[PDB]
UniProtKB/Swiss-Prot annotation, chain A:
Free-text function comment from the UniProt entry: DNA polymerase specifically involved in the DNA repair by translesion synthesis (TLS). Due to low processivity on both damaged and normal DNA, cooperates with the heterotetrameric (REV3L, REV7, POLD2 and POLD3) POLZ complex for complete bypass of DNA lesions. Inserts one or 2 nucleotide(s) opposite the lesion, the primer is further extended by the tetrameric POLZ complex. In the case of 1,2-intrastrand d(GpG)-cisplatin cross-link, inserts dCTP opposite the 3' guanine. Particularly important for the repair of UV-induced pyrimidine dimers.
Superkingdom of this protein's organism: Eukaryota
Organism for this UniProt entry: Homo sapiens (Human)
Comment text on domains: The catalytic core consists of fingers, palm and thumb subdomains, but the fingers and thumb subdomains are much smaller than in high-fidelity polymerases; residues from five sequence motifs of the Y-family cluster around an active site cleft that can accommodate DNA and nucleotide substrates with relaxed geometric constraints, with consequently higher rates of misincorporation and low processivity. The UBZ3-type zinc finger domain and the PIP-box mediate the interaction with ubiquitinated PCNA and are both necessary for the enzymatic activity in translesion synthesis.
Reported modifications of this chain: Monoubiquitinated by RCHY1/PIRH2. Ubiquitination depends on integrity of the UBZ3-type zinc finger domain and is enhanced by TRAIP. Ubiquitination inhibits the ability of PolH to interact with PCNA and to bypass UV-induced lesions.
Record note on quaternary structure: Interacts with REV1. Interacts with monoubiquitinated PCNA, but not unmodified PCNA. Interacts with POLI; this interaction targets POLI to the replication machinery. Interacts with PALB2 and BRCA2; the interactions are direct and are required to sustain the recruitment of POLH at blocked replication forks and to stimulate POLH-dependent DNA synthesis on D loop substrates. Interacts (via C-terminus) with TRAIP. Interacts with ubiquitin. Interacts with POLDIP2.
Annotated gene: POLH
UniProt protein name: DNA polymerase eta
Places the protein is found: Nucleus
Family: Belongs to the DNA polymerase type-Y family.
From Swiss-Prot, chain B:
Family assignment from sequence similarity: Belongs to the DNA polymerase type-Y family.
Subunit structure: Monomer. Interacts with the DNA polymerase zeta which is composed of REV3L and MAD2L2; the interaction with MAD2L2 is direct and requires that REV3L is in its closed conformation. Interacts with POLH, POLI and POLK. May bind ITGA3. Interacts with FAAP20/C1orf86.
Domain notes: The C-terminal domain is necessary for protein interactions.
Residues of the full protein shown: 1158 to 1251 of 1251
Biological classification of the source: Eukaryota, Metazoa, Chordata, Craniata, Vertebrata
Expression across tissues: Ubiquitous.
Name of the gene: REV1
Residue ranges, annotated region (Protein interaction domain): 2-93
Record protein name field: DNA repair protein REV1
Protein role: Deoxycytidyl transferase involved in DNA repair. Transfers a dCMP residue from dCTP to the 3'-end of a DNA primer in a template-dependent reaction. May assist in the first step in the bypass of abasic lesions by the insertion of a nucleotide opposite the lesion. Required for normal induction of mutations by physical and chemical agents.
Length: 16, 95
């Protein structure tokens, strides 16, 4: 898939 | 009070409980997210709930001690303590 950077914590902390 | 998307105090606890035990977890930025939250809660003086997060991350990084999480324990603790030395002048001893 390659999202470039793949965070989890930071991802959700920006997605909410 | 948002932390890894978790808005409530019970949410952050349960979500970061999953984040540490179940995830392949990404580059150290995700650990530094909680470090940033420690620094913000230091500015805001909400260290009551932040101490909760530190002691629970101590619990979880000691329980999930595997390479990156072992390193994350030292990284998380140290960084909170140096910013807390800056503001309060004392290190928080959860141990």
């Amino acid at each position: 898939q390659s999202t470039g950077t793949e965070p989890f914590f930071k991802q959700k902390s920006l997605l909410l | 009070g948002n932390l890894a998307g978790a808005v409530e105090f019970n949410d952050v606890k349960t979500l970061l409980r999953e984040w540490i035990t179940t995830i392949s977890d990404p580059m150290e930025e995700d650990i530094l997210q909680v470090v940033k939250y420690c620094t913000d809660l230091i500015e805001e003086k909400d260290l009551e709930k932040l101490d909760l997060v530190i002691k629970y991350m101590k619990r979880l990084m000691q329980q999930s001690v595997e390479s990156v999480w072992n390193m994350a324990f030292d990284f998380i603790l140290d960084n909170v303590q140096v910013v807390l030395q800056q503001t309060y002048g004392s290190t928080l001893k959860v141990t």
